[model samples]
Target: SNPYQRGPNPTRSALTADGPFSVATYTVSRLSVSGFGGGVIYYPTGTSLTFGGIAMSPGYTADASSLAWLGRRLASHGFVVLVINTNSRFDGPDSRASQLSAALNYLRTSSPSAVRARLDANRLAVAGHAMGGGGTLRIAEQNPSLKAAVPLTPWHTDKTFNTSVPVLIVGAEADTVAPVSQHAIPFYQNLPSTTPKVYVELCNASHIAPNSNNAAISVYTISWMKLWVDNDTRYRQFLCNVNDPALCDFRTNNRHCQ
Candidate 1:
């Protein structure tokens, strides 16, 4: 079951192309939920595929386009991704969390005609950056129905998350905005003991380093989403084993998987 020891597992490789489906991107402006306007949706370009969904929110002042790269990457790999814009630039965790939930709900019930049937509400994941990252954790805390959560350099004052949902908190080693010791570390430690979690710190990375465009961040995000959201056990190798140290980011020393 440990694919790392055997050199490399193709199914677990993030950089490798598992190109079964092409990708399509669209924008939606009508949402039933208040405080949330609309967002960008990335979905695989095909039919009859029951795909898991990942709802993404951006940090304060950032919009759906800010996380488009992350959404597209996940969509390219066979997932339906929705990156949403909050009603305002200053929206906090509560607003962001609500918007994220509504966006996923949109994908599940009211997505574009081309992809509505392909999206599965039951198998859902949540992710975000900065304040949005904090919102992601909040969603996981409030909605145990989520399959997984990935918070990138989250910024939250409260250190507690009560849910046992699996989480992967991606932190930046060189970030001053939300220090690992103060934010991500405490958040991870405060999670319910029954929850499975991973904390990845990218060395020499800044607060904005883990944004949508970061390739290393994409690798881990995609792997975690695939493993937990899609029930793709192949990706479990990257999360469960440290055998391929070189396959990880250059800052492997700061990585922790569990």
Candidate 2:
């Protein structure tokens, strides 16, 4: 779906590891999907319709183009990606959820060659930035098949999600969109016990740090998905207790990993 509000292919980047990985985006058709072994389909970027109770023009607050860094981060993690450009201006959670579902279907049914054969459907994970975080949560709740999720500053008031897969909630201590007092804490409270979850709060972060704190966050993001989606059990050492990367401390930490 072309986010008519802003033009597509607003940007591009290099892959994390040398291919065999296939990365492709159709500028004219506004359709793109790429994958290597144990790949991940990183969805839309976060967007806001309102700030401080004021509603802004669609896509104006957080443009779809804002996801350029997220794509690069995932690619650096050695995962092929599929990012969607929604029709709406803002990255509405509902719209993002729909895009995730569509991307999954495309990989399973319509993708060509390696995308169809190399994609680990059983190893698929979903992630997003900001508004996309909330969307990832919504999608994970409905799609039981999803292996894991990495939600960067997710924002949502709903707490009835029923999925018990793995979840990594990354947020900054200084953020406002999905402050610890409001969004992440509430979302964590509602998560199922059987599911393994992790919450990392950046020391001094604002709403737009995913691209800024690229190296640290990207490492954790890649590692999280690799553990779950790639089925790399060795990384599980961190699932129960992760504290090495200096940003993610699941134990004795204010975050949640239950």
Candidate 3:
């Protein structure tokens, strides 16, 4: 059975608010990082323990707030998310990668504060939308410290997947801007078979579909993070079970392997 199936039945959805953590959001400025203004940080409330973090950037011509919904969604599920803005709206994937790296570094090096100590420097992840999504892969390719990566409707010009970091590539079947054939599928196929990855293509979804508060995205994404970043074994069945093929439907194209 697909453990992540959402509803009020035997199946449980990762998108369901099952986390014990309460989330809060704050705006922060990276005093030293250049070519960027600042980022919005979302964290759990009433907890002093260290937690995993994720740094995310918006797609081309989009700002930090563009992806705030997902950030907050992840935060509510016990992650500290940093949503960043590029120095320029037209910045490419390479620049987005740099900015995301800087944002994560700032979170790591920031002085003692209410949330600083609550962040686990060793447990980190990266994500982005569109160009930013491609940038997430680029940064992960270079940084082995990242435990996981999630790219939403990624757009890149090349196939570069030498990194071992587990990835969840969210693709839109109807995405005209970055078609699944040229972008998401090729990127998935290029990854080494030794590395763990999941490719989910949403039916009739546009390039910006994930931004519209899609429940399935949250379900799979939360499970992926919980399984990898938190090292939680409870989510393994959701991604590794043989029942995945049966769970796929006209709305979701689920692909993965153990």
Model 3: per-residue Cα lDDT at residue 37 = 54
Clash pairs for candidate 2: 46-131, 59-89
lDDT of 2 by residue, 189-241 (tens): 67876677777777677767764535546656655775666555444444455
- Overall local distance difference test of candidate 2: 0.54
For all candidates in order, the CA lDDT equals 0.76, 0.54, 0.76
lDDT of 3 at 207: 92
1 or 2, which is superior by lDDT? 1
Worst 10 residues of 1 by lDDT: 246-255
Q: How does candidate 1 fare on TM-score?
A: 0.86
For 141-232, candidate 1 gives per-residue lDDT tens digits of: 88999999999989998889887678888888778988888998888888876687887777678888856377567777877787778666
TM-scores for all predictions: 0.86, 0.71, 0.86
User: Which pairs clash inside model 3?
Assistant: none
State how far residue 95 of model 3 sits from its true place (Å): 0.7
Error of 2 at 244 (Å): 5.0
Please report, as a residue range, the 10-residue window in candidate 2 with the lowest summed lDDT. 49-58
Model 3, 145-179: lDDT tens digits are 89899988999997766878888888888899889
